[PDB]
């Protein structure tokens, strides 16, 4: 009976283990892995303020892959160097470092929500020969305050970010909220950096290499409008697009089972 026990229980229930990887810089990326060495690898990238536990529930239903789920630098349990570049390109390159050291770089599937979607485009556009498929879940970076967190009872960004929030004990939410409050100086910095990070031009390399792409959106997404799927599909015409009625900005949390099943259906279609 403790919050840290609840967070670890969830991770263990999804067959995840936390590890630490030391970057070139000496800075640390903490990440969750399920250690399914027999599966094709999949890198799942979280959005602004979020962390690797944004995929912990869905990870349970993606048991056929070798999952690598990082806390991005700046976020979660990873290092938080104040002066670092947190744009998508810099973030994508560190993730390639991690994957290379694990021998998982050379053939890789990639997904991201929000910011993690803009990083996933960055990644795909920088390593097009290595990325076999791409999953963009209410992705940022396609341009067609109230995201930032000062005190406890700002939380109500909840109401803004979700339509179908899952039940989470108040103590768990409270640990997560303190982690953001504790990091708020850096969060303003990072937000300012990524507000301007537009990935539309890089996304052309996805079209050029014909990388298979699944684009998913909540119809009620108040953070980035569902009309963005028009722009992504324009830039990436091979995209498969799925919109999800009555779901907000985080389908992999709000609609765990539909989101997992829609992706696995896409993945199987590729075979």
């Amino acid at each position: 009976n403790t919050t840290q026990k609840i967070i670890q229980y969830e991770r263990s229930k999804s067959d995840l283990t936390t590890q630490s990887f030391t970057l070139s810089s000496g800075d640390k990326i903490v990440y969750a892995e399920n250690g399914n060495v027999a599966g094709e690898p999949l890198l799942l990238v979280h959005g602004f303020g979020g962390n690797k536990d944004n995929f912990t529930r869905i990870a349970r239903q993606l048991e056929n892959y070798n999952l690598i789920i990082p806390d991005l630098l700046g976020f979660g349990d990873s290092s938080k160097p104040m002066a670092a570049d947190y744009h998508s390109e810099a973030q994508a390159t560190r993730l390639h470092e991690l994957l290379q050291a694990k021998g998982l770089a050379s053939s890789i599937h990639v997904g991201g929500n929000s910011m993690g979607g803009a990083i996933s485009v960055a990644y795909a556009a920088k390593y097009p020969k290595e990325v076999k498929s791409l999953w963009l879940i209410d992705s940022a970076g396609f341009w067609s305050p109230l995201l930032v967190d000062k005190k406890e009872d700002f939380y109500a960004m909840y109401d803004f970010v979700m339509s179908k929030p899952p039940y989470i004990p108040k103590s768990v939410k409270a640990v997560f909220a303190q982690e953001r409050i504790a990091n708020k100086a850096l969060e303003s910095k990072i937000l300012a950096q990524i507000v301007e990070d537009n990935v539309e031009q890089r996304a052309k390399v996805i079209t050029e290499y014909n990388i298979p792409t699944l684009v998913v959106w909540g119809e009620e997404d108040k953070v980035i409008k569902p009309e963005t799927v028009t722009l992504i599909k324009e830039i990436i015409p091979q995209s498969q697009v799925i919109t999800m009625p009555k779901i907000g900005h985080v389908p992999m949390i709000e609609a765990v089972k539909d989101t997992a099943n829609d992706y696995k259906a896409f993945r199987e279609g590729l075979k």
Side-chain angles (χ1 to χ4, degrees), residues 149 153-245 247-248:
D149 208 85
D153 318 293
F154 274 32
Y155 264 46
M157 77 89 158
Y158 263 63
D159 274 55
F160 178 70
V161 165
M162 286 179 303
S163 297
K164 299 198 191 177
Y167 168 57
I168 303 300
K170 191 197 192 154
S171 64
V172 177
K173 286 169 159 170
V175 167
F176 288 122
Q178 271 313 314
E179 281 182 3
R180 301 195 62 200
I181 296 152
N183 194 32
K184 107 254 266 210
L186 183 44
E187 277 192 359
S188 311
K189 259 99 280 153
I190 292 162
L191 195 56
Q193 290 192 42
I194 82 200
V195 96
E196 43 152 284
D197 194 4
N198 181 105
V199 102
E200 295 173 45
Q201 173 82 349
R202 282 164 283 178
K204 293 171 177 190
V205 175
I206 299 166
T207 303
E208 185 189 351
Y209 280 73
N210 196 224
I211 303 162
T213 308
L214 183 63
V215 176
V216 173
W217 229 271
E219 303 193 353
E220 301 297 318
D221 183 334
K222 305 174 201 85
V223 187
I224 316 200
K225 56 149 100 172
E227 285 79 2
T228 314
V229 305
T230 309
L231 188 51
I232 324 267
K233 185 60 169 163
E234 182 179 46
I235 307 180
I236 306 160
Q238 35 93 346
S239 282
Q240 192 186 142
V241 180
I242 295 177
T243 68
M244 297 187 90
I247 292 303

